[PDB]
Design a protein around this ligand. Structure first.
Ligand code: 25B
Length: 215
């Protein structure tokens, strides 16, 4: 695999979003992944609608949490593969209450056919991401509240509680790291991103790595 990859530099990653006071991280993780996969399938970079999952994916629990894999399955199994544009289905859960699903008045922005579940192995996740693009992951982010930058080297790695998006890595740096997109505005971390040390399963990053497939 390449020594280093950063999908942001290819133009493949949308702007950092803001989940607000809702536990909808899982939806931002899944949607961010789809956004990138859709672009990498040869389509214009498009902001897609977390609110569609938060409100309409009843396998998951909206502002009380969810799984990215369930989101990918819901899109395929319950919405004919379709993901609406953010423009047509704006986020409406920032205060912590997700409104009822609305099926009308939205515009399809992307489609997916399925999803893959990646090995629990940082090297194999990196090799896959180098070729196929950004990957949704679950992490322990309990220690992330105060992060303002730098490579995180002592992440509390005890329980999965957050969903984020791997967009790159760097194996050659003095402390090798993952490059991770979060959903807590650009005011958090490194313009909304975090780097965590790579190779020691920091924050349990290898446990639940997956990606949508665009056909
Ligand atoms: C998003 C994480 S968060 O709210 O951004 C956050 C806040 C403080 C510290 C760290 C993170 C949500 C929060 C749910 C509960 C408020 N997390 C998730 O949805 C997790 C994402 C990865 C897999 C596990 C998942 C989770 O905790 C969960 C899934 C399903 C159900 Cl029913 C409940 C929880």
């Amino acid at each position: 695999a390449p020594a280093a990859v950063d999908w942001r530099a290819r133009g493949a990653v949308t702007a950092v979003k803001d989940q607000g006071q809702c536990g909808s991280c899982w939806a931002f993780s899944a949607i961010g992944n789809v956004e990138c996969q859709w672009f990498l399938a040869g389509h214009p970079l498009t902001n897609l609608a977390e609110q569609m999952l938060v409100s309409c994916d009843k396998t998951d629990s909206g502002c009380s949490g969810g799984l990215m894999n369930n989101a990918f399955e819901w899109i395929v199994q319950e919405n004919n593969g379709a993901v609406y544009t953010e423009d047509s289905y704006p986020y409406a859960s920032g205060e912590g209450i997700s409104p009822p699903c609305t099926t009308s008045g939205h515009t399809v922005g992307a489609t997916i056919t399925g999803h893959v579940e990646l090995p629990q192995d940082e090297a194999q996740i990196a090799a896959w991401l180098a070729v196929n693009g950004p990957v949704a992951v679950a992490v322990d982010a309990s220690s992330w509240m105060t992060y303002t930058g730098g490579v995180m080297t002592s992440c509390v790695s005890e329980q999965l509680d957050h969903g984020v998006l791997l967009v790159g890595y760097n194996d050659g740096a003095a402390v090798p790291y993952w490059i991770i997109k979060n959903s807590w505005t650009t005011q958090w971390g490194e313009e909304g991103y975090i780097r965590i040390a790579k190779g020691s399963n920091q924050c349990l990053v290898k446990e639940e790595a997956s990606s949508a497939v665009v056909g």
